[PDB]
Design a protein around this ligand. Structure first.
Ligand SMILES: *[C@@H]1O[C@H](CO[C@@H]2O[C@@H](C)[C@@H](O)[C@@H](O)[C@@H]2O)[C@@H](O[C@@H]2O[C@H](CO)[C@@H](O)[C@H](O)[C@H]2NC(C)=O)[C@H](O)[C@H]1NC(C)=O
Ligand SMILES: *[C@@H]1O[C@H](CO)[C@@H](O[C@@H]2O[C@H](CO)[C@@H](O)[C@H](O)[C@H]2NC(C)=O)[C@H](O)[C@H]1NC(C)=O
Ligand SMILES: *[C@@H]1O[C@H](CO)[C@@H](O)[C@H](O)[C@H]1NC(C)=O
Ligand SMILES: *[C@@H]1O[C@H](CO)[C@@H](O)[C@H](O)[C@H]1NC(C)=O
Ligand SMILES: *[C@@H]1O[C@H](CO)[C@@H](O)[C@H](O)[C@H]1NC(C)=O
Ligand SMILES: *[C@@H]1O[C@H](CO)[C@@H](O)[C@H](O)[C@H]1NC(C)=O
Ligand SMILES: *[C@@H]1O[C@H](CO)[C@@H](O)[C@H](O)[C@H]1NC(C)=O
Ligand SMILES: [Zn+2]
Lengths: 596, 195
């Protein structure tokens, strides 16, 4: 009766109960999301409480099988997941205080309400209101007012709570046999035990910096181009050699530069590809959209979707009688249940979102045979990568020409290619420095390299140096600008976006090479290619059973995250930017400030 | 002519569980094979040692019919030379098993909203079972090196576990009614065969 057999039998029981309990909880949540009522919310809360209580009890009971005397490397991960203490290892008062702090921060962020200084009652929240101002406005002063007000009437109330939250989380991390909360967060990418596929938690920082170093030149050229095209809209607010102000990035925090395409379009006179009109003029509905996307997935060797998907899944708004959350998500209730909740409309954006959600469902169906605890992605940046690579091929002009939404005599000019590449770069390349800077600041704050009196100073110095963005007004040690973001006020990670963005182009390049594609990588369609489907399915079926290094090598042939495929994607755009930037300056100066 | 009552096995109101399956003998009658070819959706009609069309007329000694229901992705273990939870601890067929296995979906009949927890199977056992051997014991399975004295606790687990069938499950988790047949020949004169 070795420890291995005790762990095996315990895991079998745990799985056989967890399937039922999770199915009940998921069904209750699905009913609530389709039926917004009081009885359903009570049922959902009861199911969630039961699931949490069972999980806590099993986690408490699972601590008696030490890892040192188990050698299978597949029950290791299940016991590692079950043995995580989390907030449990703490005094009752400390855990209560931590939960109160988290709830208070979430409530403060959600019920955020700024008021204009002319009449006391027309106050606007974040969504809508401030977001619309920061997205669809060209006034310099209004954007500055919104940007400062949000961080002065919300961020100022989060710093005293954030300090205690940091202290308590650091204490919990140290009690859980770590060094700081940042290391605890990095622990997702850790691989130990397998020879040749190891990955230390400290190697993450080195790999991220190494990749960002090669990212730097393309981002510098894009930054120079955006600055050159932004001086036309703001003649007397931007320095030719300085940094971009933070309240003119088209977003509230500068996470994405998507809303700048109206000002930074290369060729305005040439419209982009929009098949909404052809969709409408051919009697297309949600069923046709989903059938077309399913046919595209079957074209690469992936199977059909279950008969239960077509009956139990909602693809339209029920109407005014019922209330449902109009957010597109892919549901894996377990036990063979796969549903998609989406308020589908006749639009190209919904056409691509259908492909995204079906890629999610295909990933979920791939690893249905794995044990319960291993039914997830290889790491926190694999599901979204599959979604993006599945949606990228659907937007290619040839794919739209093959299914009938584009005229057979539609010639593709190289100007539209530049427009499409600029659109992609404004949302893909413009977010990596932001994510890297935010995660590095959080890691250094958790470690202790930034004292409590230098938080804002270090934050703005990093934003000036790395991202290239300068604050419009000075900030002292009372504000908490990072806490204004949703992922900081609510406890969440951020490096997953950077990691997923770097994986998705690796996957796309590998699949397009496997499809015998010739030409630029941005003109790649993986339709009618069994080899690409098999190559993707080899990794999709593993789940968490193997280290993410092996899963990545199963597709791209490389042992580690790379950046070359992403740069190959934007090569024509890079050459065009280099040609257009010959009379401008590439780079920025940290010294210049708008208030200087 | 007294026809073989192949109409209560396939048309019963309720079916037994996997760990305790019914076994009703059929003999002293003329056998037919048309009241079995109905119910057109049949998930599996595989046969071993006999052919379905050839099965029209043969003389044997005794016919055994076993009745139980499992999930969709478990019919594969009702075949000779299979290993699994249902093969090891629930029902083993010999390597020289002669007969046919009939399986069909029963989602409408054997599924309830909120779950149907009236159908149970054995999860852990100390050993395996020889073919055509049953075990209705309800003792506590000891997973450690100490005796539990009959009460669940640390390293103590209840053996049987309910299926919890629901109408929204997938095709591999949906209920599937299964009937197996075994044909045996003895020194007694053959009587059980039709015209
Ligand atoms: C994907 O392929 C189908 C089927 O095309 C056939 O198989 C290919 C491997 C290749 O050998 C083709 O020459 C074959 O015809 C395409 O569907 C066909 O599209 C053409 C358009 O030129 C049309 O005339 C046919 O009727 C279609 N056949 C059908 C619908 O059964 C499909 O367009 C391809 N998808 C692409 C290229 O994106
Ligand atoms: C989670 O916390 C529990 C206690 O709440 C830990 O169990 C104790 O761990 C210490 C560590 O050396 C032992 O000395 C004790 O004997 C354990 N039991 C008790 C009752 O204190 C448990 O180890 C923690 N989990 C992890 C992974 O460290
Ligand atoms: C739940 O939705 C169904 C129809 O979708 C219907 O019973 C009713 O609208 C909702 N139930 C309750 C109790 O409101
Ligand atoms: C790990 O456990 C599984 C579950 O029983 C088993 O199938 C597998 O063979 C084990 N691994 C090794 C290397 O034996
Ligand atoms: C998928 O469904 C279509 C139509 O229902 C069918 O023609 C096709 O054969 C199916 N594919 C598989 C692999 O069963
Ligand atoms: C596109 O092709 C034309 C035709 O040769 C060429 O003159 C032009 O430089 C190319 N690039 C752009 C951005 O127009
Ligand atoms: C099986 O039972 C159903 C339920 O009453 C009945 O309608 C059907 O005729 C029966 N079929 C046979 C072959 O007995
Ligand atoms: Zn997604």
């Amino acid at each position: 009766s070795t420890i291995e057999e005790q762990a095996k039998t315990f895991l079998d029981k745990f799985n056989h109960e967890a399937e039922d309990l999770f199915y009940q909880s998921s069904l209750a949540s699905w009913n609530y999301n389709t039926n917004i009522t009081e009885e359903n919310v009570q049922n959902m809360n009861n199911a969630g409480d039961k699931w949490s209580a069972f999980l806590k009890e099993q986690s408490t009971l699972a601590q008696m099988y030490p890892l040192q005397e188990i050698q299978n490397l597949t029950v290791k991960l299940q016991l590692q997941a079950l043995q995580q203490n989390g907030s449990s290892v703490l005094s009752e008062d400390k855990s209560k205080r931590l939960n109160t702090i988290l709830n208070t921060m979430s409530t403060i962020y959600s019920t955020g309400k700024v008021c204009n200084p002319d009449n006391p009652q027309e106050c606007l929240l974040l969504e809508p209101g401030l977001n619309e101002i920061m997205a669809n406005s060209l006034d310099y002063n209004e954007r500055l007012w919104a940007w400062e007000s949000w961080r002065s009437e919300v961020g100022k109330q989060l710093r005293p709570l954030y300090e205690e939250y940091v202290v308590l989380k650091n204490e919990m991390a140290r009690a859980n046999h770590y060094e700081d909360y940042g290391d605890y967060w990095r622990g997702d990418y850790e691989v130990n035990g397998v020879d040749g596929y190891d990955y230390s938690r400290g190697q993450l920082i080195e790999d991220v910096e190494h990749t960002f170093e090669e990212i730097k030149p393309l981002y510098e050229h894009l930054h120079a181009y955006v600055r050159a095209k932004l001086m036309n809209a703001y003649p007397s607010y931007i320095s030719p050699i300085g940094c971009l102000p933070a309240h003119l990035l088209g977003d509230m925090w500068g996470r994405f530069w998507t809303n700048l395409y109206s000002l930074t379009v290369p060729f305005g006179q040439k419209p982009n590809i929009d098949v909404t009109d052809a969709m409408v003029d051919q009697a297309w509905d949600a069923q046709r959209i989903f059938k077309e996307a399913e046919k595209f997935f079957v074209s690469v060797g992936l199977p059909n979707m279950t008969q239960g998907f077509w009956e139990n899944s909602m693809l339209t708004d029920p109407g005014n009688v019922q209330k449902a959350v109009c957010h597109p998500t892919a549901w894996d209730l377990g036990k063979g249940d796969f549903r998609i909740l989406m308020c589908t409309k006749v639009t190209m954006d919904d056409f691509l979102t259908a492909h995204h959600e079906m890629g999610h469902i295909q990933y979920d169906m791939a690893y249905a045979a794995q044990p319960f605890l291993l039914r997830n992605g290889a790491n926190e940046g694999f599901h979204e990568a599959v979604g993006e690579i599945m949606s990228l091929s659907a937007a290619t002009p040839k794919h739209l020409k093959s299914i009938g939404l584009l005229s057979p005599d539609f010639q593709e000019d190289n100007e539209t290619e530049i427009n499409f590449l600029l659109k992609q770069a404004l949302t893909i390349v413009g977010t990596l420095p932001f994510t890297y800077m935010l995660e590095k600041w959080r890691w250094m704050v958790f470690k202790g390299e930034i004292p409590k009196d230098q938080w804002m100073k270090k934050w703005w110095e990093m934003k000036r140096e790395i991202v290239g963005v300068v604050e419009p007004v000075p900030h002292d040690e009372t504000y908490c600008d990072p806490a204004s973001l949703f992922h900081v006020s609510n406890d969440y990670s951020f490096i997953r976006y950077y990691t997923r963005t770097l994986y998705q182009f690796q996957f796309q390049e590998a699949l397009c090479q496997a499809a015998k594609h010739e030409g630029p990588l941005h003109k790649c369609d993986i339709s009618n290619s069994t080899e690409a489907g098999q190559k993707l399915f080899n990794m999709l079926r593993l789940g968490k059973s193997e280290p993410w290094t092996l899963a990545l090598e199963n597709v791209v042939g490389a042992k580690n995250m790379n950046v070359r495929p992403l740069l190959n994607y934007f090569e024509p755009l890079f050459t065009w930017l280099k040609d257009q930037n010959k009379n401008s300056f590439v780079g920025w100066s940290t010294d210049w400030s708008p208030y200087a | 002519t007294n026809l073989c009552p192949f109409d209560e096995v396939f048309n019963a109101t309720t079916f037994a569980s996997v760990y305790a399956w019914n076994r009703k003998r059929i003999s002293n009658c003329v056998a037919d094979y048309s009241v079995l070819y109905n119910f057109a959706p049949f998930f599996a009609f595989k046969c071993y040692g006999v052919s379905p069309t050839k099965l029209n007329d043969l003389c044997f000694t005794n016919v055994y019919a076993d009745s139980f229901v499992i999930r969709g992705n478990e019919v594969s273990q009702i075949a000779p030379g299979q290993t699994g939870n249902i093969a090891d601890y629930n029902y083993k067929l010999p390597d020289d098993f002669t007969g046919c296995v009939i399986a069909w979906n029963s989602n409408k009949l054997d599924s309830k909203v909120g779950g149907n927890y009236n159908y149970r199977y054995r999860l852990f056992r100390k050993s395996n079972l020889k073919p055509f051997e049953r075990d209705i014991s309800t003792e506590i399975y000891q997973a450690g090196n100490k005796p539990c004295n009959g009460v669940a606790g640390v390293n103590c687990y209840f053996p049987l576990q309910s299926y919890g069938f629901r109408p929204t499950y997938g095709v591999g988790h949906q209920p599937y009614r299964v009937v197996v047949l075994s044909f045996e020949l003895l020194h007694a004169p053959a009587t059980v065969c039709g015209p």
